[PDB]
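Example with several molecule types.
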Amino acid sequence: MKLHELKPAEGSRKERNRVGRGVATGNGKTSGRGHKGQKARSGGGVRPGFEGGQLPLFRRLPKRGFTNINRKEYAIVNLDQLNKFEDGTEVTPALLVESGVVKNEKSGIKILGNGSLDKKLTVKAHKFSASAAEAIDAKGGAHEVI
Amino acid sequence: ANYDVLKLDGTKSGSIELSDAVFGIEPNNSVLFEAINLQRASLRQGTHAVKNRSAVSGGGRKPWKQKGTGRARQGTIRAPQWRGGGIVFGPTPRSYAYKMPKKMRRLALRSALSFKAQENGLTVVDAFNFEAPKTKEFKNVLSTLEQPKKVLVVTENEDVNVELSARNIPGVQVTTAQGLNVLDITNADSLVITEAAAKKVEEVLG
Amino acid sequence: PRVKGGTVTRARRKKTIKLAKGYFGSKHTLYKVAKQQVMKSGQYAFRDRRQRKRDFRKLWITRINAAARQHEMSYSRLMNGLKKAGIDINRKMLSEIAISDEKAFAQLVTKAKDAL
Amino acid sequence: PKMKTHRGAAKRVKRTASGQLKRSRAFTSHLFANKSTKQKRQLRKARLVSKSDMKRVKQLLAYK
RNA sequence: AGGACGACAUUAGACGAAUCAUCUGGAAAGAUGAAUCAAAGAAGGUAAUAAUCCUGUAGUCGAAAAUGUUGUCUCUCUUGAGUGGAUCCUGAGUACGACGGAGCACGUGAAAUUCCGUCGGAAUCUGGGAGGACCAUCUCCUAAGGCUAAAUACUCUCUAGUGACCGAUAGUGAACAGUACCGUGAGGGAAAGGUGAAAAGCACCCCGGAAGGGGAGUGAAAUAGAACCUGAAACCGUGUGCUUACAAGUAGUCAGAGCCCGUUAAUGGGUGAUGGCGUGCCUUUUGUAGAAUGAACCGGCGAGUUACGAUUUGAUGCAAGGUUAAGCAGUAAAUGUGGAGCCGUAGCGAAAGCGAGUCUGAAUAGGGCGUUUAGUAUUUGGUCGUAGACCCGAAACCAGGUGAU
RNA sequence: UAACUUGGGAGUCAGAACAUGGGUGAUAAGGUCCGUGUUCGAAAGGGAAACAGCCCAGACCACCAGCUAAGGUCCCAAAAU
RNA sequence: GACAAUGGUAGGAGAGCGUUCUAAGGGCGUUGAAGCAUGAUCGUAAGGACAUGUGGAGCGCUUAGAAGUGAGAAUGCCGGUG
Ligand SMILES: [Mg+2]
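Resulting structure tokens for the full complex:
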């Protein structure tokens, strides 16, 4: 483009609505607010969740439960994200990270079995599910809980 | 991807191979528009202000009684409808800059450079050799290899004598391979880049 | 930047003032009353462009009625007979004929009489 | 500034896999003699926040 | 503590390249033609718009004197280790406790932790304190003495600059002022810019007591003459083309003779004998010609904005991935670097937990929520939240002062 | 020729007369409270002298064309003395 | 091209006119810019030109950007004049 012939992508820009600027716009005198009341006043909205005095919803339902501050949570790796490795490889937490399969390892890796393996590997992680460990030791190769 | 390498006189030297990943893509105009809009919005210092009700001098007391005088009810001599003062919603000091993902910044540079190379706006030269700054000498160089009036000169690293010789010519701008921006490239009619600078551009952007 | 009101208000008001040329007193001088009068006159003109078409048709029928009584007919029966004869002349043409050419109107009346 | 969560609401609901909010039931916790056994058994299952209520109270829980 | 010799920086300054002619004009920098300088084509002046006319600019040079830093000498001070380890020393009305309070995000509570008032009141290395009541074991530390730069906050000022900031009802209250003026006092608080390039600011004559004026003269221009650039509207007059003294009106509109003119030249313009129809505008209302509200008239000014979050839609980049924040470098840019962090690729459950399932349940029953892929970053528009949050308006409340002329 | 589902943005919560089925009142009210239609509200045009709510009818803009609705045809004032 | 639709208050949706400033391009101006005054001109509307008089130095056009962006009413504020 030249600097005197700029055009934006079609559909990307749009002009803002200006209210209270005459009758023909459609938003003139009362500016879209209707007639008198609490909602037509400056700074006049009522609080979100307020129901006019009827008991609000989040005070007639009971509280429930607690939160455990020592909760653990694992980085999940399913069984079909291991098909981008070659046979014989030693899949280790240091390798899943650099390979971009795990961004953040929270409490350690945990292997789950959701796809199909179709590879022969030796995997070493923190936790396995029954199906995952079973499916790894079906094409050969083993697993080692570290 | 072949480009002639001229000398400071219009005679030809060897050719050169510039990558088609940098020079030679299909220029994206949406990203160019957004990049130009971004760069130019980041140049303004929004230093402007007005005084509202609170900041105008004086105006503490009530002008007259609420009832009984036959006049309109007023609260202060600095309300907005008074000639005294008090602005309602004017300008306030703020910044206008914003940001784009960096994959888009590189795409904008690549599409601005390739547009010059498809309009025959790119000229590669072997070397600039200026021992002392002399504008009359640079003018003749620019006229020998016929250039338009708006030219952007690009060197590999900062060259004190070349940059100091093209400084007072109207329409000429000098920069470095790493100081390339979308506003300078699209404002120019032609690029005059050296061989080393072209190789350096070909890698950082590739 | 600041946009001060300049020259657009005066030009807009002066157009409306000029449209009120010939009105009585301050109705051709001051903007507010002039604008009200120009609005009202636009509304009147709209309403009257449609009453013109009723007024002139009412005039033609009066003239045809007067011309038909001179041949011992009323407008009612003359139009009935002309329709039964198939003649398709306007009420506007039927009264210009009766004004300018009396013999032609007489011949029309005889045909209207024979179709009854 | 950031928007603030409604803490009393955060202690009472949780978000499901789609955008729904799972909730608990009122008329528990007291006076169980005036109920039949079917009533007591069925007050034990959880429900969802209705769509007409979501419209009102939705910015209250945006960070949950 | 105090001497020496230096080096920078302030506080005045100096030098600093390159143009002529004709036309229009009161005047040229403009137009036309032919030249020149540039490490200087920033800017301001000059009788209109100048890189080459002036002040300057890029660049380079400069201090008798006084300050401020900063070096190198001088100067002035001064030994440093190892083994024994439990013989001696190691901060007392202290630490703690009870009662009444306060501060810690925390409302005295499972309140640990930290301070104040009143009373009580320890131990001594096999010691003492903390790790959210308390006990035991472990782990970390060693109170009741003191000093300490840098990274951080602010601007009445000084120096050099900048602006998709205002342009005389704006911008400071104030371009000429905390002054006129008002009030016993504390205190409140204005209005008011522009001759011309140059004063060349009208010699002299006439009417007039003067003020004002008509000529003459200056000037490109005096309807630029000091109440001085331009000079709108309300409002006040003078002269005229058409019309009006038997007529009942929201003052127009549609039809239409007669009389007068002649245009952005087109089935033109001004006036109007006479006929038809016709109860202003705004707000607020079930409903207003309303005898319901508001406006004497004209001019200026005068009301959904911005920052940071949330959500949804459009656009664009990349895609099982997407993206950086502060910081550092850079011209107060683009950009480069920076992967702490954030969202997504997996859910269910109060939780331990299990996982394409999971919870409930004795149940491999039934049911709830899920699975059988598309996200993410920036930005335009709509709406919401926190902020005065579309604008103007109370009676009142509290704090600190001023008054018994 | 619509209906339903999901999402963005609303305004409304003072109603009135007429016809008809009812309560209340006194088989009073241009009264008051409900059911069922229509019109006004937010609807100009023609008729009902004038007259939001009654009768006929729903205005995109020209025209000095024609046919009809309600209501009308001695003069005011169009059409049958 | 045939056919159909086009009254409207709270209110939803769309497309535009004009004002001040900035960027790039291209122009006009002492042989007279902006402003002001008059006219019998053009466009579906907001609005845009041209000619003449006054005025005496600045101002349009195209594409894009940004807003102190439009007044007839507030017993509105200030000035002037009935
Ligand atoms: Mg007068």
